[PDB]
Amino acid sequence: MAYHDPLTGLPNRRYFFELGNRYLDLAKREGKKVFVLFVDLAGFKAINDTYGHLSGDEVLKTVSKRILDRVRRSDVVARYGGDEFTILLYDMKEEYLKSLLERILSTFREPVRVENKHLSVTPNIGVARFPEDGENLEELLKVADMRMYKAKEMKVPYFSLS
Amino acid sequence: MAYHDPLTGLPNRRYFFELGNRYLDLAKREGKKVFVLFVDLAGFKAINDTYGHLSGDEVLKTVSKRILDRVRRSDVVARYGGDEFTILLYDMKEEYLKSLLERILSTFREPVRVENKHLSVTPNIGVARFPEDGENLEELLKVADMRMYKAKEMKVPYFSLS
Ligand SMILES: Nc1nc2c(ncn2[C@@H]2O[C@@H]3COP(=O)(O)O[C@H]4[C@@H](O)[C@H](n5cnc6c(=O)[nH]c(N)nc65)O[C@@H]4COP(=O)(O)O[C@H]3[C@H]2O)c(=O)[nH]1
Ligand SMILES: Nc1nc2c(ncn2[C@@H]2O[C@@H]3COP(=O)(O)O[C@H]4[C@@H](O)[C@H](n5cnc6c(=O)[nH]c(N)nc65)O[C@@H]4COP(=O)(O)O[C@H]3[C@H]2O)c(=O)[nH]1
Ligand SMILES: Nc1nc2c(ncn2[C@@H]2O[C@@H]3COP(=O)(O)O[C@H]4[C@@H](O)[C@H](n5cnc6c(=O)[nH]c(N)nc65)O[C@@H]4COP(=O)(O)O[C@H]3[C@H]2O)c(=O)[nH]1
Ligand SMILES: Nc1nc2c(ncn2[C@@H]2O[C@@H]3COP(=O)(O)O[C@H]4[C@@H](O)[C@H](n5cnc6c(=O)[nH]c(N)nc65)O[C@@H]4COP(=O)(O)O[C@H]3[C@H]2O)c(=O)[nH]1
């Protein structure tokens, strides 16, 4: 089996762990870097509370589709939680980290048409690197989760430092 | 999600398709070859009919574990059918084909001891190559399935020609 979240169509949490650990095993064999991004969408709770779960869902579908479109089909974009997304970028380079983040930040920031309204979410991104930040997905996700929370705290759209 | 067959512990048919199509997308991005092997184990029907499904199961567990230790953890070994196994070898080379097949053939051929009885299965392997034999997993599997059946029909324990 290999399940997808039906609303967003993105791989789910369980498939992300399985697929993710497979990408790290392959990158160890190939000598390639892997970056793990943790994306939190800020204005989400406000959407569902004001407009309802259905409006929040349309914000996710649209935001999910947009993000897929802007990263390689060979990369993994997963719905981790209710409004949390995890991204696995295979064969990534540290030099172009900042440039790839502005591509993903500009996508997530795009407003979404909901029942005539144009609603917007604000992203906060935590970045973890393989092999620098860990040996397995679990360790990279805890580090990317931690850094995503440092970014939200510094009111900066991303945090990637050791 | 991403399911495994509980008896053999190997990825199941559905996970093989999902993971397999992900490896082909990545190999298209990386310029690397992928070989798809289709392995049929003859003698299997004879084991279960003579000794029972429990003896047949022990022949699979053992044969699955043996194959799993003789290929890279980054490669996919899946239980396709009752006694059919599919193998996805990432970054494989046409020149080493014959040598790798003799490694897998020698493993599968090893007898399984269960209640003293020496129980042996005989493999027949069909080989398909990416990008020569197809664009997606489905096409490569139909070609390797076809060639596994041509190998069975012949003296040779493998068939890989166009
Ligand atoms: N700046 C930048 N953007 C990136 C990079 N990697 C992916 N993207 C973005 O992610 C989109 C989807 O990539 P894809 O599914 O790999 O699908 C790609 C891929 O299969 C192929 N392609 C384009 N350029 C290359 C390339 O330089 N190398 C390889 N291997 N394939 C490429 O054509 C498809 C369409 O590409 P786009 O329309 O441009 O759309 C791309 C592009 O917006 C990158 O390394 N740098
Ligand atoms: N996993 C992953 N890594 C990414 C992605 N985007 C950028 N990178 C990483 O950053 C490196 C350089 O990105 P760039 O400056 O956009 O420089 C890129 C860009 O100028 C171009 N390019 C490559 N792929 C595409 C593409 O699919 N679409 C477009 N439009 N341009 C591409 O070729 C250059 C070199 O490609 P690489 O050697 O692969 O080297 C890439 C890759 O290691 C991504 O969406 N996913
Ligand atoms: N002749 C041959 N046999 C192959 C080849 N690839 C895999 N194998 C076989 O598959 C077993 C498991 O490989 P692994 O999971 O990648 O796990 C490997 C891998 O993580 C590492 N390793 C060994 N040699 C290499 C290597 O040359 N390059 C890389 N990247 N890792 C290696 O040590 C682990 C255990 O390897 P072994 O005990 O040798 O056991 C190997 C070996 O019997 C190959 O290209 N040629
Ligand atoms: N997916 C996959 N492909 C395989 C496997 N076995 C061989 N190949 C492919 O065939 C090439 C040559 O294998 P080799 O002559 O045994 O020559 C190998 C072997 O002598 C050695 N080596 C590589 N991996 C291992 C290993 O895991 N264990 C041991 N003991 N030796 C290894 O390094 C040599 C060249 O390495 P590569 O560039 O990897 O080049 C490998 C690889 O492209 C496999 O189990 N899985």
Residue numbers in the entry:
A (entry chain A), B (entry chain B): 87 to 248
Quote the authors verbatim.
In order to understand the structural determinants of tDGC thermostability and to investigate the catalytic mechanism and feedback inhibition of this biotechnologically important enzyme, we crystallized tDGC (i) in an active-like conformation with two A-sites in proximity, and (ii) in an inactive conformation, with c-di-GMP bound to the I-site. The wild type tDGC protein co-purifies with c-di-GMP and co-crystallizes without any extraneous addition of ligand. To investigate if c-di-GMP binding at the I-site causes conformational changes at the A-site, the structures of the active-like and inactive dimer were compared. The backbone and side-chain conformations are closely similar, suggesting the absence of signal propagation between the A- and I-sites, upon c-di-GMP binding. We therefore conclude that stand-alone GGDEF domains are inhibited predominantly through domain immobilization mediated by c-di-GMP bound at the I-site. Thus, this mode of restricting interdomain mobility could constitute a widespread mechanism of regulation and feedback inhibition of GGDEF proteins devoid of other regulatory domains.
We report the structure of tDGC from Thermotoga maritima, an important enzyme for the large scale enzymatic synthesis of c-di-GMP and the first GGDEF domain from a hyperthermophile. We expressed and crystallized a domain of the TM1788 protein from Thermotoga maritima (248 residues, WP_010865403) spanning residues 82–248, hereafter named tDGC. Cellular levels of c-di-GMP are tightly regulated by the opposing activities of diguanylate cyclases (DGCs) that synthesize c-di-GMP from two GTP molecules and phosphodiesterases (PDEs) that hydrolyze c-di-GMP into 5′-phosphoguanylyl- (3′-5′) - guanosine (pGpG) and GMP. C-di-GMP synthesis from two separate GTP molecules requires dimerization of two active GGDEF domains, with the loops bearing the GGDEF motifs of each monomer brought in close proximity to initiate the cyclization reaction.
